[PDB]
Amino acid sequence: MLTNLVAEPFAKLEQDFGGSIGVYAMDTGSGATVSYRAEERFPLCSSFKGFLAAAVLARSQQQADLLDTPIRYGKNALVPWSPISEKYLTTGMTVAELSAAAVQYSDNAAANLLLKELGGPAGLTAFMRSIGDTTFRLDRWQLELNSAIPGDARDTSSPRAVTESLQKLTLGSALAAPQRQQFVDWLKGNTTGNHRIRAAVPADWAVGDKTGTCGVYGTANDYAVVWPTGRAPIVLAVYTRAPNKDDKHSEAVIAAAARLALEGLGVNG
């Protein structure tokens, strides 16, 4: 009844891109939604790292000393694109610092260390099941989880389930209030998403996001919570893929899809 009250030209956008775009956006005030390929599976890529940090925060509700626990690691832990953790190789970092780095810089070594702490891909999947997400699956470690093979359900979710879970974790009751605000603050501090959903969001609105970029099959994504002033927040997810391994991803297409979603919800921006 409240889904796609206003049609938007997502099909033309994905056709110009040369692939598939999946969008699910929720107006948390009215419950109205914009939905396009929203129940199709798309590779998570590094977007799993946001949910990983939420899982760490959930564990910290039962383990008061978890976030400040110091974690030391060897050079063998430093995998490509570890911009924060490489600066602390000789010192270690706390669990909270690793979580912030995984969210805000997409730090690979940090994410691997935290994934191990949680019991691996199955442990993160179990956390997502515990909040009612039956779609999400993480199956592999980095960097193998970025393969983005057409038709492969490993390491995928849907735009809808990503949005639904993001809403539960940032605005709902899945985390206790201090942990919820910490998750929001990490998302707000993200540095890797300026050309994605954020590029569709006016500068005077608050926003947090987590990106993912697989590097193959035109596969990249972003999810965000957006606080337009004077109305309820919007939660949305934009995921892309394309048929050929060497197809390029596009940040501009993600931003454009986010703009269409806000327009479809009647959010003036």
Side-chain angles (χ1 to χ4, degrees), residues 213-228:
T213 309
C214 275
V216 286
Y217 290 101
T219 295
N221 55 63
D222 196 23
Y223 55 75
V225 182
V226 176
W227 287 265

Side-chain angles (χ1 to χ4, degrees), residues 104 213 219 235 241 255:
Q104 300 177 325
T213 309
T219 295
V235 187
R241 66 159 298 113

Side-chain angles (χ1 to χ4, degrees), residues 7 16 46 74 125 183 266:
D16 288 346
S46 283
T125 299
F183 186 42

Side-chain angles (χ1 to χ4, degrees), residues 20-23 36-45 125 128-129 133-139 148-162 217 219-221 238-242:
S20 300
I21 302 170
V23 177
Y36 186 79
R37 301 191 184 282
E39 300 85 20
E40 292 186 29
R41 288 186 171 281
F42 290 80
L44 288 160
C45 317
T125 299
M128 299 297 283
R129 294 290 177 283
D133 184 332
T134 55
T135 307
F136 179 103
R137 56 186 291 185
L138 204 73
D139 294 84
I149 293 165
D152 185 358
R154 290 176 299 173
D155 309 298
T156 64
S157 195
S158 66
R160 179 169 183 163
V162 168
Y217 290 101
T219 295
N221 55 63
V238 180
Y239 280 67
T240 76
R241 66 159 298 113

Side-chain angles (χ1 to χ4, degrees), residues 109-167:
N112 288 332
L113 289 164
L114 294 170
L115 194 54
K116 196 180 175 139
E117 152 92 32
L118 279 181
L124 183 52
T125 299
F127 171 69
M128 299 297 283
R129 294 290 177 283
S130 82
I131 69 169
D133 184 332
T134 55
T135 307
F136 179 103
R137 56 186 291 185
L138 204 73
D139 294 84
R140 290 172 291 168
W141 306 80
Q142 308 212 98
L143 292 162
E144 287 81 1
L145 64 79
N146 292 291
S147 51
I149 293 165
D152 185 358
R154 290 176 299 173
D155 309 298
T156 64
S157 195
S158 66
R160 179 169 183 163
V162 168
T163 294
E164 289 172 338
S165 289
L166 186 64
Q167 174 173 4

